[PDB]
Amino acid sequence: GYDRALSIFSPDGHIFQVEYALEAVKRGTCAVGVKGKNCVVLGCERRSTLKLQDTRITPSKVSKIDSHVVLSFSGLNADSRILIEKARVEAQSHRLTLEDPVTVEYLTRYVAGVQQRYTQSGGVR
Amino acid sequence: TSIMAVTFKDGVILGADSRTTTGAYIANRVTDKLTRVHDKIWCCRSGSAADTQAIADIVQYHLELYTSQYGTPSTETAASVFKELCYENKDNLTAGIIVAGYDDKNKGEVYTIPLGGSVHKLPYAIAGSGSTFIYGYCDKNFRENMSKEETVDFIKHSLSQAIKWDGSSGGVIRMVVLTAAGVERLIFYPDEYEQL
Amino acid sequence: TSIMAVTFKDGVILGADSRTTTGAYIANRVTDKLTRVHDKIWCCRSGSAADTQAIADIVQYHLELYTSQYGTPSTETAASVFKELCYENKDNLTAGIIVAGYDDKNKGEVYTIPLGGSVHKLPYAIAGSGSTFIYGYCDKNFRENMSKEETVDFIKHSLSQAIKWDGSSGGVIRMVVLTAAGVERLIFYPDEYEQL
Amino acid sequence: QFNPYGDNGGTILGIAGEDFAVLAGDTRNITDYSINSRYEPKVFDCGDNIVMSANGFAADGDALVKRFKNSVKWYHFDHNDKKLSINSAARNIQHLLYGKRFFPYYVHTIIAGLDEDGKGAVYSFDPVGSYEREQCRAGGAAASLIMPFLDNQVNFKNQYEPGTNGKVKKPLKYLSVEEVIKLVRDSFTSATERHIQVGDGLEILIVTKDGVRKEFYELKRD
Amino acid sequence: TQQPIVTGTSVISMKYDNGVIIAADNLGSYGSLLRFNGVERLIPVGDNTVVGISGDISDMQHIERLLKDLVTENAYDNPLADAEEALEPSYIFEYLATVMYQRRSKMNPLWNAIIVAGVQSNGDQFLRYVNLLGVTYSSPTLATGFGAHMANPLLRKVVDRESDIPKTTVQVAEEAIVNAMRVLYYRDARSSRNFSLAIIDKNTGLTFKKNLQVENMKWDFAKDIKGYGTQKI
Amino acid sequence: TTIVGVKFNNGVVIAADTRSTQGPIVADKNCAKLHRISPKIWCAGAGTAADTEAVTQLIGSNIELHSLYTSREPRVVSALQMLKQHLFKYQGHIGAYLIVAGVDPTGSHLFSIHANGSTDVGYYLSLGSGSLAAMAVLESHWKQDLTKEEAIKLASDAIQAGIWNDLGSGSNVDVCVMEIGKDAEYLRNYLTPNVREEKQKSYKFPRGTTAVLKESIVNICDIQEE
Amino acid sequence: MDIILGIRVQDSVILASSKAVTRGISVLKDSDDKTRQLSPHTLMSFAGEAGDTVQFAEYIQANIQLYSIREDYELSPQAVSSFVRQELAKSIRSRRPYQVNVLIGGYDKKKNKPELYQIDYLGTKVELPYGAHGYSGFYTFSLLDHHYRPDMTTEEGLDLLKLCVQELEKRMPMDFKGVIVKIVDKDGIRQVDDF
Amino acid sequence: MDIILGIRVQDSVILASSKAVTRGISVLKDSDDKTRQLSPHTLMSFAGEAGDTVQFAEYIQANIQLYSIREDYELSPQAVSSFVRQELAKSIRSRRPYQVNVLIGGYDKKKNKPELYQIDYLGTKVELPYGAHGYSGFYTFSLLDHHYRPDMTTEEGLDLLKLCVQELEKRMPMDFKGVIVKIVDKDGIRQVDDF
Amino acid sequence: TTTLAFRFQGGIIVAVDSRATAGNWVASQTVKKVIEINPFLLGTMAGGAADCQFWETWLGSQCRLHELREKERISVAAASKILSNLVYQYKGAGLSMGTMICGYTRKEGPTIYYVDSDGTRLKGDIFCVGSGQTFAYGVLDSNYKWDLSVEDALYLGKRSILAAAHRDAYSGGSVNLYHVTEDGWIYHGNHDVGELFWKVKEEEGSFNNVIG
Amino acid sequence: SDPSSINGGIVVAMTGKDCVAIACDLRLGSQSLGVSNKFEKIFHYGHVFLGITGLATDVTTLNEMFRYKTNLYKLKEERAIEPETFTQLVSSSLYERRFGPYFVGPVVAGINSKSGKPFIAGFDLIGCIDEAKDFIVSGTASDQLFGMCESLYEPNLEPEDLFETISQALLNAADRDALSGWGAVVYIIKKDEVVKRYLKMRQD
Ligand SMILES: [Mg+2]
Ligand SMILES: [Mg+2]
Ligand SMILES: [Mg+2]
Numbered sequence A: 001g002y003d004r005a006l007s008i009f010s011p012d013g014h015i016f017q018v019e020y021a022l023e024a025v026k027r028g029t030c031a032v033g034v035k036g037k038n039c040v041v042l043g044c045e046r047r048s049t050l051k052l053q054d055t056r057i058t059p060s061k062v063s064k065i066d067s068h069v070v071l072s073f074s075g076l077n078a079d080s081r082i083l084i085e086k087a088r089v090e091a092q093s094h095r096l097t098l099e100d101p102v103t104v105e106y107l108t109r110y111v112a113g114v115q116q117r118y119t120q121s122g123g124v125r
Numbered sequence B, C: 001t002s003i004m005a006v007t008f009k010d011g012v013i014l015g016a017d018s019r020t021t022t023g024a025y026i027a028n029r030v031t032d033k034l035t036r037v038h039d040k041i042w043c044c045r046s047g048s049a050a051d052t053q054a055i056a057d058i059v060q061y062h063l064e065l066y067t068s069q070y071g072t073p074s075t076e077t078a079a080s081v082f083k084e085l086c087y088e089n090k091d092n093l094t095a096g097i098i099v100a101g102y103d104d105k106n107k108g109e110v111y112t113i114p115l116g117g118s119v120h121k122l123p124y125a126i127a128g129s130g131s132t133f134i135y136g137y138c139d140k141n142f143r144e145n146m147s148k149e150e151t152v153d154f155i156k157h158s159l160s161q162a163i164k165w166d167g168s169s170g171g172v173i174r175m176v177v178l179t180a181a182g183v184e185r186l187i188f189y190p191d192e193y194e195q196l
Numbered sequence D: 001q002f003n004p005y006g007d008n009g010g011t012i013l014g015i016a017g018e019d020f021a022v023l024a025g026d027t028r029n030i031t032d033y034s035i036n037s038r039y040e041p042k043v044f045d046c047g048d049n050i051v052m053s054a055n056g057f058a059a060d061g062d063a064l065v066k067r068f069k070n071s072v073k074w075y076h077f078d079h080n081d082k083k084l085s086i087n088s089a090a091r092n093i094q095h096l097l098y099g100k101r102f103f104p105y106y107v108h109t110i111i112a113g114l115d116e117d118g119k120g121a122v123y124s125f126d127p128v129g130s131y132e133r134e135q136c137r138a139g140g141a142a143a144s145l146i147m148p149f150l151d152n153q154v155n156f157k158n159q160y161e162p163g164t165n166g167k168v169k170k171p172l173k174y175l176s177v178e179e180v181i182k183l184v185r186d187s188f189t190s191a192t193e194r195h196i197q198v199g200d201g202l203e204i205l206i207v208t209k210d211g212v213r214k215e216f217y218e219l220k221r222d
Numbered sequence E: 001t002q003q004p005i006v007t008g009t010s011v012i013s014m015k016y017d018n019g020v021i022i023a024a025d026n027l028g029s030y031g032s033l034l035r036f037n038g039v040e041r042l043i044p045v046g047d048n049t050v051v052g053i054s055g056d057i058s059d060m061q062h063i064e065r066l067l068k069d070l071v072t073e074n075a076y077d078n079p080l081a082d083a084e085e086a087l088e089p090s091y092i093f094e095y096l097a098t099v100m101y102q103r104r105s106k107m108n109p110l111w112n113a114i115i116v117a118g119v120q121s122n123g124d125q126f127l128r129y130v131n132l133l134g135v136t137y138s139s140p141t142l143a144t145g146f147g148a149h150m151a152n153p154l155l156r157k158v159v160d161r162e163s164d165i166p167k168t169t170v171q172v173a174e175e176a177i178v179n180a181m182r183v184l185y186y187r188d189a190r191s192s193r194n195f196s197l198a199i200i201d202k203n204t205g206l207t208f209k210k211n212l213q214v215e216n217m218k219w220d221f222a223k224d225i226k227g228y229g230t231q232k233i
Numbered sequence F: 001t002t003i004v005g006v007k008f009n010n011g012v013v014i015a016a017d018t019r020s021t022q023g024p025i026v027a028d029k030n031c032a033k034l035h036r037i038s039p040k041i042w043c044a045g046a047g048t049a050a051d052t053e054a055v056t057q058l059i060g061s062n063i064e065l066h067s068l069y070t071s072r073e074p075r076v077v078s079a080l081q082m083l084k085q086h087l088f089k090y091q092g093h094i095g096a097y098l099i100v101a102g103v104d105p106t107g108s109h110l111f112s113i114h115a116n117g118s119t120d121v122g123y124y125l126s127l128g129s130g131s132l133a134a135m136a137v138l139e140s141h142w143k144q145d146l147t148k149e150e151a152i153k154l155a156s157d158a159i160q161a162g163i164w165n166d167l168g169s170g171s172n173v174d175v176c177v178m179e180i181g182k183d184a185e186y187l188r189n190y191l192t193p194n195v196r197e198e199k200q201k202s203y204k205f206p207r208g209t210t211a212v213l214k215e216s217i218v219n220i221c222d223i224q225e226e
Numbered sequence G, H: 001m002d003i004i005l006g007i008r009v010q011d012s013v014i015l016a017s018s019k020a021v022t023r024g025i026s027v028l029k030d031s032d033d034k035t036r037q038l039s040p041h042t043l044m045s046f047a048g049e050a051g052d053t054v055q056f057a058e059y060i061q062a063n064i065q066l067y068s069i070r071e072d073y074e075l076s077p078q079a080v081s082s083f084v085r086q087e088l089a090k091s092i093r094s095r096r097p098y099q100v101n102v103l104i105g106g107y108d109k110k111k112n113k114p115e116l117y118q119i120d121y122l123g124t125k126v127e128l129p130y131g132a133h134g135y136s137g138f139y140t141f142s143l144l145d146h147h148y149r150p151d152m153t154t155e156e157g158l159d160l161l162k163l164c165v166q167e168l169e170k171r172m173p174m175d176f177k178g179v180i181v182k183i184v185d186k187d188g189i190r191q192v193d194d195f
Numbered sequence I: 001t002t003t004l005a006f007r008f009q010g011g012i013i014v015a016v017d018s019r020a021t022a023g024n025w026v027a028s029q030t031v032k033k034v035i036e037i038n039p040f041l042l043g044t045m046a047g048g049a050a051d052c053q054f055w056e057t058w059l060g061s062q063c064r065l066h067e068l069r070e071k072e073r074i075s076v077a078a079a080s081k082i083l084s085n086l087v088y089q090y091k092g093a094g095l096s097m098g099t100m101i102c103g104y105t106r107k108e109g110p111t112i113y114y115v116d117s118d119g120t121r122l123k124g125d126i127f128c129v130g131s132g133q134t135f136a137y138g139v140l141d142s143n144y145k146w147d148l149s150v151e152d153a154l155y156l157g158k159r160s161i162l163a164a165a166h167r168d169a170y171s172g173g174s175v176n177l178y179h180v181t182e183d184g185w186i187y188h189g190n191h192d193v194g195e196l197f198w199k200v201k202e203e204e205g206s207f208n209n210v211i212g
Numbered sequence J: 001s002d003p004s005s006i007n008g009g010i011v012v013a014m015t016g017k018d019c020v021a022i023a024c025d026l027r028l029g030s031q032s033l034g035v036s037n038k039f040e041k042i043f044h045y046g047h048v049f050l051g052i053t054g055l056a057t058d059v060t061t062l063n064e065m066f067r068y069k070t071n072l073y074k075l076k077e078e079r080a081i082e083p084e085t086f087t088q089l090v091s092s093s094l095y096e097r098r099f100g101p102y103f104v105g106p107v108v109a110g111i112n113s114k115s116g117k118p119f120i121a122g123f124d125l126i127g128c129i130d131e132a133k134d135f136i137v138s139g140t141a142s143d144q145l146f147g148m149c150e151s152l153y154e155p156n157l158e159p160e161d162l163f164e165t166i167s168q169a170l171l172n173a174a175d176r177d178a179l180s181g182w183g184a185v186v187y188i189i190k191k192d193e194v195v196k197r198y199l200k201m202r203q204d
Helices: A016-027 A077-099 A104-117 B048-069 B076-090 B129-141 B148-165 C049-070 C075-088 C128-141 C148-165 D059-076 D085-097 D143-153 D177-194 E056-075 E088-105 E148-157 E170-187 E221-222 F049-070 F077-090 F131-141 F148-166 G052-070 G077-091 G136-149 G154-171 H054-071 H077-089 H136-147 H154-171 I049-070 I076-089 I135-143 I150-167 I195-202 J058-078 J085-093 J142-150 J160-172
Strands: A033-036 A041-044 B003-008 B010-015 B020-022 B023-029 B034-038 B041-047 B094-102 B108-113 B121-123 B124-127 B173-177 B182-188 C003-009 C011-016 C020-022 C025-028 C036-040 C041-047 C095-102 C107-112 C120-122 C124-127 C173-179 C182-188 D011-015 D022-025 D029-031 D034-036 D051-056 D107-114 D120-124 D131-134 D136-140 D200-207 D211-217 E006-008 E009-017 E019-023 E028-030 E033-036 E042-044 E049-056 E111-118 E125-131 E136-138 E141-143 E192-201 E204-213 F004-007 F011-017 F019-020 F027-030 F034-038 F039-045 F096-103 F107-113 F119-121 F124-127 F175-178 F187-189 F214-219 G004-009 G013-016 G021-023 G026-029 G034-037 G042-048 G102-106 G113-119 G126-129 G129-132 G179-185 G188-192 H004-008 H015-018 H022-023 H026-029 H035-039 H043-048 H099-108 H114-121 H126-127 H130-132 H180-185 H186-194 I002-008 I011-014 I020-022 I024-029 I034-038 I040-044 I098-105 I109-116 I121-124 I126-130 I174-181 I185-194 J010-016 J020-027 J028-030 J033-038 J042-045 J048-054 J103-110 J118-123 J135-139 J184-190 J193-199
Touching: A016 J010, A033 D131, A077 A104, A077 G052, B003 B041, B003 B094, B003 B108, B003 B129, B003 B148, B010 B034, B010 B041, B010 B094, B010 B108, B010 B148, B020 F011, B034 B048, B034 B173, B041 B048, B048 B076, B076 B094, B076 B108, B076 D120, B076 E056, B094 B124, B108 B124, B121 B124, B121 G136, B124 B129, B124 C124, B129 B148, B129 C128, B148 B173, B148 C128, C003 C041, C003 C107, C003 C128, C003 C148, C011 C025, C011 C036, C011 C041, C011 C095, C011 C107, C011 C148, C020 H099, C025 E170, C036 C049, C036 C173, C041 C049, C041 C075, C049 C095, C049 F077, C075 C095, C075 C107, C095 C124, C095 C173, C107 C124, C120 C124, C120 F049, C120 I185, C124 C128, C128 C148, C128 J028, C148 C173, C148 E033, C182 E009, D011 D051, D011 D107, D011 D143, D011 D177, D011 E019, D022 D051, D022 D107, D022 D120, D034 E136, D034 E148, D051 D059, D051 D136, D059 D085, D059 D107, D059 E088, D059 E136, D059 I135, D085 D107, D085 D120, D085 D131, D107 D136, D107 D200, D120 D136, D143 D177, D143 J142, D143 J160, D177 D200, D177 F027, D177 J142, E006 E056, E009 E049, E009 E111, E009 E125, E009 E148, E009 E170, E019 E042, E019 E049, E019 E111, E019 E125, E019 E170, E042 E204, E049 E056, E049 E088, E049 E192, E056 E088, E056 E111, E088 E111, E088 E125, E111 E192, E125 E141, E136 F148, E141 E148, E148 E170, E148 F131, E148 F148, E170 E192, E170 F131, F004 F096, F004 F107, F004 F131, F004 F148, F004 I076, F011 F034, F011 F039, F011 F107, F011 F148, F027 J142, F034 F049, F034 F096, F034 G154, F034 J193, F039 F049, F039 F077, F039 F175, F049 F077, F049 F096, F077 F096, F077 F107, F096 F175, F096 J033, F107 F124, F124 F131, F131 F148, F148 F175, F148 F187, G004 G042, G004 G102, G004 G113, G004 G136, G004 G154, G013 G113, G026 H154, G034 G052, G042 G052, G042 G077, G042 G179, G052 G077, G052 G102, G052 H186, G077 G102, G077 G113, G077 G126, G102 G179, G113 G129, G129 G136, G129 H154, G136 G154, G136 I135, G136 I150, G136 I195, G136 J033, G154 G179, G154 H026, G154 I135, G154 J048, H004 H043, H004 H099, H004 H114, H004 H136, H004 H154, H015 H043, H015 H099, H015 H114, H015 H154, H026 I121, H026 I135, H035 H054, H043 H054, H043 H077, H043 H180, H054 H077, H054 H099, H077 H099, H077 H114, H077 H126, H077 H180, H099 H180, H114 H130, H130 H136, H154 H180, I002 I040, I002 I098, I002 I109, I002 I135, I002 I150, I011 I040, I011 I109, I011 I150, I034 I049, I040 I049, I049 I076, I049 I098, I076 I098, I076 I109, I076 I121, I098 I126, I098 I174, I109 I126, I121 I126, I126 I135, I135 I150, I150 I174, I150 J033, I174 I195, I185 I195, J010 J048, J010 J103, J010 J118, J010 J142, J010 J160, J020 J048, J020 J103, J020 J118, J020 J160, J042 J058, J048 J058, J048 J085, J048 J135, J058 J085, J058 J103, J085 J103, J085 J118, J103 J135, J103 J184, J118 J135, J135 J142, J142 J160, J160 J184, J160 J193
Parallel strands: none
Antiparallel strands: A033 A041, B003 B010, B003 B124, B010 B173, B020 B023, B034 B041, B041 B094, B094 B108, B108 B121, B173 B182, C003 C011, C003 C124, C011 C173, C020 C025, C036 C041, C041 C095, C095 C107, C107 C120, C173 C182, D011 D022, D011 D136, D022 D200, D029 D034, D051 D107, D107 D120, D120 D131, D200 D211, E006 E028, E006 E049, E009 E019, E009 E141, E019 E192, E028 E033, E042 E049, E049 E111, E111 E125, E125 E136, E192 E204, F004 F011, F004 F124, F011 F175, F019 F027, F034 F039, F039 F096, F096 F107, F107 F119, F175 F187, F214 J193, G004 G013, G004 G129, G013 G179, G021 G026, G034 G042, G042 G102, G102 G113, G113 G126, G179 G188, H004 H015, H004 H130, H015 H180, H022 H026, H035 H043, H043 H099, H099 H114, H114 H126, H180 H186, I002 I011, I002 I126, I011 I174, I020 I024, I034 I040, I040 I098, I098 I109, I109 I121, I174 I185, J010 J020, J010 J135, J020 J184, J028 J033, J042 J048, J048 J103, J103 J118, J184 J193
């Protein structure tokens, strides 16, 4: 299997592949989150360079991970689907074994763990 | 067991090894497998020792009572009495018996009675676990109308080979000679027959 | 099966009957049980016909590849290859093989490989169901350094008796002679060997 | 271990008409994949206008027929040569079979004849003696191949009158002896084609007020 | 219930225009060991019947004694014992068939297969089979054990149905029987070369042939057969 | 099943009956048991019918690829070696009992194969439930130096013995003749000695005899235009 | 476990399941709920070998809930039953098969029709007006064959169900400690708390 | 059959026996009386293999009735129980043994004492204050060990018996369709028709 | 097999199916499963056909001998016990029976005894025996009353066998009905299940699950 | 215990003049218990028809499997699969499970769209092909079906005559089998019209 170390340290102590991944986030459409006293609101930007779009069927920017947790993102759209799928699977696995839905912190800790793993695993970006 | 009986010019000779076995343990190394059911009618026993002893005791009783009423029985008659017991009780017996005897009218005769209880009159017979290894040798070396010395040598050589290959057989080679002259017992020790 | 191999002054001869059996039905009356694994290394097969054919084919392949790399293999080497297959696959095989070959340095050699997969170097060897009946005859009649004609007679007479008593054995007697002069095949028909 | 039973194959067929009755059976006897005989009679005239067959294990079959024939003989001796009626024969056979309830005759028995009103009669037995009067009965190896055909062509099962579409059944009109024999021959010809134990020959015994007549027909020998 | 110990193999037979023929080899096997080489398995009863027996030899010897006793018993108080009231093949068979079925019914069988061959008073050919189960049947040709599988197909080519019997001479019938015995020697591992053959004819009576041998055997073609597939030498 | 193989002057012939059974029931009355491995290598199979057909086609497929790879016409010894090694590996579980015959640049060949992998060589062979009936005929009439006409006669006579005497065999005789320097001739239904006689009665029903609940047209066509 | 029944009426599906759990000698519990909600309008009852029943049911539940979140859509009863059948048909040739029989009662919101599916541990599926597993059908089917109508109300279905349970309580040797009854219709799933 | 209980109080013996008869799949009867009166002051209940139970009970009944007529005298409960034990002890080494367990409740008119004997199919006899056969004791003995007093009234005995039956109906898997209860005292044998 | 018998105001109804099977093979559709012991007593056939036939016509002989000796009709209690005592002698040997002995006498009234080959003898009001017994019990239990008319009771027995014939694979063919009175039994015909099913479906409105 | 007779059922197929017919019963059971009277055992993929008897879970699985495979076939080949080709696909698919087989008895029926020739075929559970000219039978009443077909069948029957023959063959066979019946369907197949008829039969 393809084992090449793509994420590595540089002489100044930086991992450039991780830093360049942040540049892809900088390019993505803007997302914002604000929590009130009894709610949280997620706002998302839609670039109007694309009209003649079918808004009924086009992938929406905010995704339900479970009935009580949502996820929005900025960056590569295709990459986000993989994280969303993994998070949705873990949410159902947690309900199945612990008999309680995930806390928001737990779900965050899982997704963050997946992202970290892809920074020191061979053959992946 | 390695047992055999061979007719010759002057009568018949019975031969046997002396090993009795319960498994791999030799329970008796000096056994006498040549058994007398009448003065000049003997037998060789193979199979269950209990069964063949019980049968031989009953036959001896039958022939003793026959003799008191009708005089000396023929070898054929003795074989028939053995057969009757072996055939009618085939389900409950494990016995292979060779009957050998000397008449003056019929001279030397040999009858073999295998497991089923059938009877077969033969010029010579071999039986027991050790007999399997000497079918070839005996068929090639047997002749009719041999002398006493030739027949002793034939049996000595045959049972020597049977003992050599069959672990169940061993000890001394016993023989009983049946002629008009009477009854002679012979014994041959390991140091003699092993060097043949 | 009745099979044997015998070393003599000029080399070694292999012998076999031609009967192959599934129960009491003779599935082949003219079988060739003498099998070539190298020019002057042959074998006799007994047991499962499938197993001994599969083994012999693999050995022939191994010795063909040995020859291409290291030159002519010894008879000991051929026996070792047979042993390796028979020992390591003892749970799944029913094979009793006699290996016989002629070197110029070692002359005639015979190795027997019984069921377990052990090896035994011998002056001569017998195997198969029919061999049980000729242990006595062969032990009494074998001599070392016999002539070609004497060895042919010894094998012919021995297998004749094995065929006579073993229902599983029969048909023709095949033989293969291995000497410095080359490889000679012999065949002997019933009308010849039955009258011996 | 000794097995006291065997299977000799064979197939038999009994049909009751209005004033007649037929009992037919193939003449082939077998064990496993071998043919013992191409002509071994299996249906027997037992006297008093009664025909009988005991199909299955032939040793038990021959024993039973032999004992029934004997029972007919002794019925005459004991009861002033009175004719043994078909119903009385049937009850008697039950007692012969049940007598060996715990070591049974391994056979399927069928008898045929006329009842005391002159009408055709067939009786059928299991190995241990349970019995029934019947109009139509096949027994033995190819029984499962023959009975459905008879249900359809003798009793007109699943057949309705054209135009009514299931509302009116096809009426059960009486069959002649010539008509029955046609159906018997076709039953065995078809069974011969598809069952390995059926073949060689077909022997039919016909029973009327005039007595017992025989007819023989060749079957395929493969 | 028992198991057969010393055993005899095939018995074969057929009808011809004027009588019947029956044959069986002279071997008594002890499993695969060919132990006894002089066993007569065809036993004549009078001058009109021959009983051929296969299976357990101890049980055969018992049946032989029953038949011997049957002849003795029939002669008792019987002035026509050698004429009108002699034992018929049909009488001898029915007696044996009775015994065989009775013994299987006590779960203690005579472990045999039996063929009774003979000629009746009126000249009619008699040929019928019975075994350890008490099963009986008749046919223009009859054979036991291996003979059933190999001899019958050959004998049925001569007499295929009843109407072929008058068209079959004694020379043609004996030829067919002898050939069948050769085929059995080629192919049955529990058979021997030595056999006996008996002819029962309505004109010439009972002819009993002992010490016959299988001859005219083909073995020469064996010399060309080498290996089991690829071997050339 | 009865199958035979017979060598002759300039080739080899194989034959078979046409009955296939499910226990005591005849599944097919005109079954084809002569299988083609290659144009001039044919085999006949007894035992498990699916196994004999499958193992023939697998080896036949691989034989064809081998023939193309080597630019040589296939050999019988290749088919034999490939069949036995396949069957040995499956320790008898693949129930294929075969008689393999053919002609190739080396000459004419006749082998047989048991399901557990054992092979044998011969001038005349038989396999199947009717093999004893067939072998009886072969042992009675076989001689050295048979002609083509004599070998066809002997082979079919041996199958007939199986047809008439073995309950596992029946119906027709199929033959295939493979002669050196000629096309192999497959003679399907070479003998037809078991045609059924005319029935006594016609069983054609009057129309409307069967009771019907519902009728409807079944759409076998694809989704239509317009 | 033991008795599970199902009946499809005009506008709903009703599932009845026994409350007893028996560990050989003793009845360990008399209030056990042998059912799992797979989606808002689909309910599955189950019976078979101990442990495997709940393990299988919760596994199916997790999978259907995962589908619902991924697509933001409820699968039809027919689609759910096909998924369940395939899982059991896969299981029957496994190293250790799920020894579980199920009934699936669902209301199809697209067709506005109730649907009842019966599936055994082999993966044998049939759509039925009424069904059961084990010996339950042997006692109840003759009553259902007589009284059932396709246009029955929910109340009439419950009454026919009571007659079935009464016959079970009379002729069955085992004490199954009554049944929990649940109704599946256009408004979802609810439990009848007095039966 | 299934459950048979017995309790000896101050002045009487009380026997309780189930009413169900089950032949494998179905409950054929729910009113079966598993008892026989052997003499005016002696009652025997029974449970075991089908057929043998009634055959044995009626055989014993016939024998005791024969003794009563011959001697014009009622045997003591102790004497009857010894006769029954011997019959079962004889039976256990027979060709086909009686597979029957019994309780014998009697009032001895000479000693003015109630007596309860427990005998199993082997012929194992014990005199007890309270007893049972099969699994009945496993559920009931802990309650009887706690509440039993030798000076209890008949009414107190019936109440303790009700508590035992309630525990059986709760924890036993089989539905035994209630019990028939009979009292044996100085005045003879009577059935409690409401239990 | 499905056989039933129940007590009611007007006597006893006996109803049986007609099918006999050997594995999956349907041997007969015309089996007589009610044994006419005598003009006053009936017995049902379940388990072994021969065992039931043989021993219940034997029972008829014993009943005939009883009334010759005692000059009085045998009771159902005494008749049933003769059979149960006989089969108890054979216990272990392998007899197979499950039968209802049915009768109506002066001293007893309508009486049914279930008799078993392992020795069981039970008096009762409703009994149902066979591979389809559970189906017939359902219809019986939910419709049974003591005060049924002879007409309605006959139908209930017919309908209960039909229920079993429909669901149980090993029950079917035709239904045989009997009504047992004090003056003897009365036969109420043979009813083909094929024709009966469609007739009952239309007239009753039952079996809506089946298309007709 | 025997997987091939747990659920029950039968299928039969026949050839006629320029037509074929295939028919099946409608029963599904759990041994003695009848479970469903609407379990059809005949499926079709284009103009090729497939009947399957045996273990019902495998019947459903194999239908789904052959729908899967014939759909991919059509997409790649750009034409509907023919009866001769489909027969080989069934055989191949069954034999791949040689030592863990589907417990079924499949039957293929159809008319070749190019030659117009009527075609039928049968299989054992592991793939062996029976290609009969006249008729094919399968299921728990296969013995009974062999008996009916062997006597009732004659060659070159017109479509409406063939319907009567195959219907009577199925009905009377099913009535002698405990595990078959509870309704029946008959397909009459011509080159470009197929008629489906449900039969009225006894429901015991
Ligand atoms: Mg020693
Ligand atoms: Mg044939
Ligand atoms: Mg039914």
